[PDB]
Design a protein around this nucleic acid. Structure first.
Lengths: 83, 37, 121, 148, 49, 69, 241, 171, 49, 54
RNA sequence: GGCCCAUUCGGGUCUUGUAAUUGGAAUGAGUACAAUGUAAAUACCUUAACGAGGAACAAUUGGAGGGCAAGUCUGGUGCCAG
RNA sequence: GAGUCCCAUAACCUUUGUACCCCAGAGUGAGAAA
């Protein structure tokens, strides 16, 4: 982690200063820290999965808008060709 | 359930099952191999 | 007025047993009261056939209570002895039920009798 | 209480298995006018285009719109009142017919919509599994009807 | 082509289930509660305007 | 994929560090460095603001919460 | 799953008088008018509260269409605490008891049924529930039991006939308040099996509209039942426009 | 058969997807063949409908048509009117294909199992072994669908693989 | 008047004198209040005064 | 009645056998406005014949 | 974990996945004792024996996307872009 | 100074003893006897 020099740390204004049962229960407390580690990792893997398809999605959406953007241009060439 | 199986908390009923605890011990050990890497 | 009610006439009984006798060939038929009781609670029955000459008739009058609570059509017919002959079993049958399958080869026949049955009720 | 409408049980993706003969067609105001222009009977043409019995429906809104048009379109009003045409009641204040037909379609998925208005046509196109009917050339045409 | 279409349809039937619930005979056995949760703020009703 | 063979589209395997150099560690790659460079620049950028943030500090600034902290 | 000696977290639902019992699974749950027994063998919750042992009953959607309607996400359910309810089609207490649970002791449930065999059970259940009056009578002729009914704020109908719409009109006209609630369960096969269900669903809606009922909502009862919906409306005598 | 007016409608494509999957059709060609027959029959019924009631042509041709449609089994006995002919859909004909009856009668547990059994010469209608899955069964023919006598499943000796494996077990 | 009425051919007063019935060639029989500002509801003695 | 042994391999067979006769008897009593005991007598006699047989 | 919707953020749904192992049946192309067929003969039909797990008894055609190097080329405002 | 107000008149676990049990469950559905 970043370590701010104490000379920089000292001369800062007020707002932003860096601030620097056993037995069964242990098996039933280590267990709770066990499961919450599972859910966070599972969510983080599902969440990052979603962003991957999002990048794919915005890309496949981007090739349709350009086709939609371009084809409209010719329609306004033939339309105003009459006018 | 058998009266012995009923417990005063879900965690006790959950911690009673053997299949679930084995699965977490295996899976939790896997994550540290990724997290402590 | 009679406990066994409504009772199909000579004609309507005719198409019913024809559905029953074929339905046995197709393994679509549950035969006898306890199977009739079985199907109603599981809600897999089209409609239920009951013999009106049953000894005693009250042995099967529980089924209409189950049947109409589940909104399942039901009917009575004169002779148990004929139903077993249709049903294909070598003993009399007092109650029978047709199980639910929209993929059955006889959906039109069953629905045809079902419609008449509803009008009778 | 955030709300997400369920997709109609009648629909398999873009296919409406629910619609079967005979069909229901909701009639738009322009559809009468163009029909008279092309000398195409309302009932015969539908049954010709679709090869099925057709049960046309005119709502209060479109009926109001026709009879708003004035003396010039009294013929359209008369044809619109043909007894083979059934009429459909409405319960919303506006006489705007375009939105009323759309609202009915989103909600019930047996209805064909007979119209030529370009504005209406795209919207019903966006709504999934709604056959679109129009009069073009010398007879009617049905676009999103798999059975034809 | 037959086999390929067969896998296509059963895949599509699966896809149908995700976009909407699809009838599967009702309840079989004891009622085990709603597998996946009841969402309190959710209505799926089509509204009459 | 237009007018391309699958042989045209073939996987090239990643070479490893020399056994003579095994002690020092893994052989970095372009992907590895962009992690190193990005992390360094982020830290320098935040440090950059803090220094500028310190220099323009007004010695006469008063916020009430100093009596507590 | 929802096995006896296990425990669940019971919590209020959006519709007053309804609860969710959470756990490994969730359950739609309503508090018991009559603790200590089940009307149709349903599952029950018991909580110790200061200590009195209050009981709740689990609600099975596959047995009661209304419960499945809640679960499909019905926005408005007029059935609520302290409200008079007219339940048409009271085959038994399978659904009526739960409706009686929602209204509470202050409210009442007017249960209507025709056949005699189910009514005997309805009578038996209705007795243990003082807020329930079992009106075993034909709904097609409300004038027969107008003597026994006053105003009802919501009318619910599970009656399975081709001619439901007319029945709803008469009962709504005689007994329902202005701006009152109406909740109709529609089975396509019973009304018109020739045509697809979805067509019947629109057709009944129009019958409600000409009966001065502005319908508000319709929900298909998938996956609990096939070819069904609950239609919710408001009885606006003044004007549906 | 004839190609449709617009083969590329998404609703259409989903239509053939559902039909082929639920009936196990090999390709879209069978669907268009059945659609062609349905178009012809419905056009004939339409033209008859145009004719005046009690017209001798209308009466005679309509009666013959409805009787044929009853015999093939598509049109029910109680629906003997040209309007119900006009109400027909391809699904009714496709039900009448032999695959569907082999599946629905219980001889086969799937449309594909029915297809293979039919093309494998295990199915007999009366005296005739039918290996054409597109065979259209009538009401009378429906009840006579059985296993062909020459089939191992129809009363004959075990197939080649059965006796071969039994032999290899023997020594 | 209104667009929707095309040619008045029959006009009648409601027998209570409170409404006007009009019949035009457009095919619609319309009802009108004899006094547009008046309302058919029973009034309180205060409102009546 | 399997929790308090009301109805109680050959022993089980009578239990399954007798349980059915209790079930039918309940039907006869429950829906008869004024049930009699004539059927109960012969139904019990049928059980007695089965009891001797096993 | 899979899947659906959504420009956006996000939202919605639940028995799924195998690029894992394994079992016994069915039979066609074929190869063929034959017979039939025919002026004769081919072919068709019928029918002994053999004839399937990569069932290698190894149908195609077209279209949309990826990703990989101590590799190579090109423009630049490092570490980028094509 | 300090939770009576969750029955130490009790709950739970362990040992011993007594009496019974080792079938399916949303039970299966045509054999059995010879």
């Amino acid at each position: 982690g970043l370590k701010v020099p104490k000379a920089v740390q000292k001369e800062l204004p007020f707002k932003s200063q860096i601030h620097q049962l056993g037995g069964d229960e242990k098996k039933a407390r280590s267990f709770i820290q066990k499961v919450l580690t599972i859910s966070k990792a599972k969510d983080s893997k599902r969440k990052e999965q979603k962003a991957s398809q999002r990048k794919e999605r915005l890309k496949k959406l981007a090739k349709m808008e350009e086709e939609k953007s371009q084809r409209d241009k010719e329609k306004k060439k033939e339309y105003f060709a009459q006018n | 359930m058998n009266r012995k199986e009923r417990k005063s908390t879900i965690l006790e009923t959950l911690m009673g099952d053997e299949a679930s605890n084995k699965y977490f011990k295996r899976k939790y050990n896997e994550i540290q191999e990724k997290s402590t890497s | 007025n009679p406990k066994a009610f409504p009772l199909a006439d000579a004609a309507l009984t005719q198409q019913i047993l024809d559905v029953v006798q074929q339905a046995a060939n197709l393994r679509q038929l549950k035969k006898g009261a306890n199977e009739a009781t079985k199907t109603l609670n599981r809600g897999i029955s089209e409609f239920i056939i009951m013999a009106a000459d049953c000894e005693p008739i009250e042995i099967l009058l529980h089924l209409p209570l189950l049947c109409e609570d589940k909104n399942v059509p039901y009917v009575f017919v004169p002779s148990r002895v004929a139903l077993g002959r249709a049903c294909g079993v070598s003993r009399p049958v007092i109650a029978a039920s047709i199980t639910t399958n929209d993929a059955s080869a006889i959906k039109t026949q069953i629905y045809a009798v079902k419609d008449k049955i509803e009008t009778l009720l | 209480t955030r709300n997400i409408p369920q997709v109609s049980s009648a629909l398999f993706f873009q296919y409406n298995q629910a619609i079967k003969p005979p069909y229901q067609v909701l009639i738009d105001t322009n559809f009468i006018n163009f029909s008279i222009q092309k000398k195409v009977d309302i009932v015969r043409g539908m049954m010709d285009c679709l090869l099925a019995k057709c049960n046309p429906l005119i709502t209060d809104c479109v009926m109001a719109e026709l009879e708003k048009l004035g003396p010039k379109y009294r013929i359209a009003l008369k044809l619109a009142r043909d007894p083979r045409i059934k009429r459909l009641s409405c319960s919303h204040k506006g006489t705007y017919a375009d939105d009323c037909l759309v609202h009915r379609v989103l909600q019930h998925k047996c209805y064909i919509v007979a119209t030529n208005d370009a504005g209406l046509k795209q919207r019903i196109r966006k709504i999934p599994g709604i056959p679109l009917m129009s009069v073009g050339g010398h007879a009617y045409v049905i676009e999103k009807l798999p059975d034809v | 082509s037959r086999v390929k279409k067969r896998k296509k349809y059963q895949k599509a039937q699966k896809k149908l289930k995700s976009v909407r619930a699809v009838y599967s005979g009702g309840q079989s056995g004891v009622y085990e509660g709603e597998k996946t949760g009841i969402k309190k703020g959710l209505t799926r009703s089509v509204k009459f305007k | 994929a237009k007018l391309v063979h699958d042989v045209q589209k073939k996987q090239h395997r990643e070479r490893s560090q020399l056994t003579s150099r095994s002690r020092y560690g893994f052989l970095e790659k372009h992907k590895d460095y962009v992690k190193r460079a990005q992390d360094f620049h982020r830290k320098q950028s935040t440090l950059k603001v803090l220094r500028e943030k310190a220099k323009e500090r007004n010695p006469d600034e008063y916020y009430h919460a100093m009596h507590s902290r | 799953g929802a096995r006896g000696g296990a425990k669940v977290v019971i919590e209020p639902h959006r519709h007053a008088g309804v609860y969710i019992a959470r756990g490994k699974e969730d359950l739609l749950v309503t508090k018991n008018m009559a603790p200590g027994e089940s009307v149709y063998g349903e599952k029950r919750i018991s909580v110790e509260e200061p200590p009195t042992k209050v009981e709740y009953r689990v609600w099975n959607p596959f047995r009661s269409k209304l419960a499945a309607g809640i679960m499909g996400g019905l926005d408005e359910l007029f059935i609520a605490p302290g409200k008079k309810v007219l339940y048409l089609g009271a085959a038994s207490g399978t659904s009526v008891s739960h409706v009686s649970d929602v209204v509470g002791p202050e409210g009442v449930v007017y249960a209507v049924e025709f056949s005699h065999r189910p009514g005997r059970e309805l009578i038996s259940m209705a007795k243990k529930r003082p807020n329930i009056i079992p009106i075993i009578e034909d709904a097609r002729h409300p004038q027969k039991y107008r003597m026994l009914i006053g105003m009802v704020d919501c009318v619910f109908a599970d009656v399975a006939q081709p001619d439901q719409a007319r029945i709803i009109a008469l009962n709504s006209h005689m007994f329902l308040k202005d701006q009152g609630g109406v909740v109709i369960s529609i089975k396509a096969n019973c009304i018109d099996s020739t045509v697809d269900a979805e067509t019947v669903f629109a057709r009944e809606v129009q019958k409600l509209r000409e009966e001065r009922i502005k319908p508000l909502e319709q929900l298909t009862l998938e996956p609990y039942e096939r070819d069904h919906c609950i239609v919710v409306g408001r009885y606006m005598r003044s004007g549906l426009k | 058969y004839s190609t449709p007016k617009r083969p590329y409608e998404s609703s259409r494509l989903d239509a053939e997807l559902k039909l082929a999957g639920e009936f196990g059709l090999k390709n879209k060609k069978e669907i268009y063949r059945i659609s062609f027959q349905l178009s012809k029959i419905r056009r004939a019924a339409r033209d008859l409908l145009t004719r005046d009631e009690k017209d001798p042509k209308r009466l005679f041709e309509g009666n013959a048509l409805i009787r044929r449609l009853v015999r093939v089994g598509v049109l029910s006995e109680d629906k003997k009117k040209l309007d119900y002919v006009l109400a027909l859909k391809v699904e009714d004909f496709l039900e009448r294909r032999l695959q569907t009856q082999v599946y629905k009668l219980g001889l086969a547990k799937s449309v594909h199992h029915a297809r293979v059994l039919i093309t494998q010469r295990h199915i007999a209608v009366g005296k005739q072994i039918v290996n054409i899955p597109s065979f259209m069964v009538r009401l009378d023919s429906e009840k006579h669908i059985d296993f062909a006598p020459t089939s191992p499943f129809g009363g004959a000796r075990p197939g080649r693989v059965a006796r071969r494996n039994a032999a290899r077990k023997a020594e | 008047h209104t667009k929707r009425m095309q040619h008045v051919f029959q006009v009648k007063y409601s027998m209570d004198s409170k409404y006007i019935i009009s019949g035009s060639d457009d095919g619609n029989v319309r009802l009108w209040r004899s006094k547009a500002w008046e309302r058919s509801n029973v009034k309180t003695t205060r409102e009546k005064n | 009645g399997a929790e308090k042994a009301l109805f109680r391999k050959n022993k089980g067979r009578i239990s399954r056998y007798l349980a059915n006769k209790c079930s039918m008897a309940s039907r006869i009593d429950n829906y008869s406005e004024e049930p009699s005991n004539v059927f109960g007598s012969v139904l019990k006699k049928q059980v007695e014949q089965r009891l001797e047989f096993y």
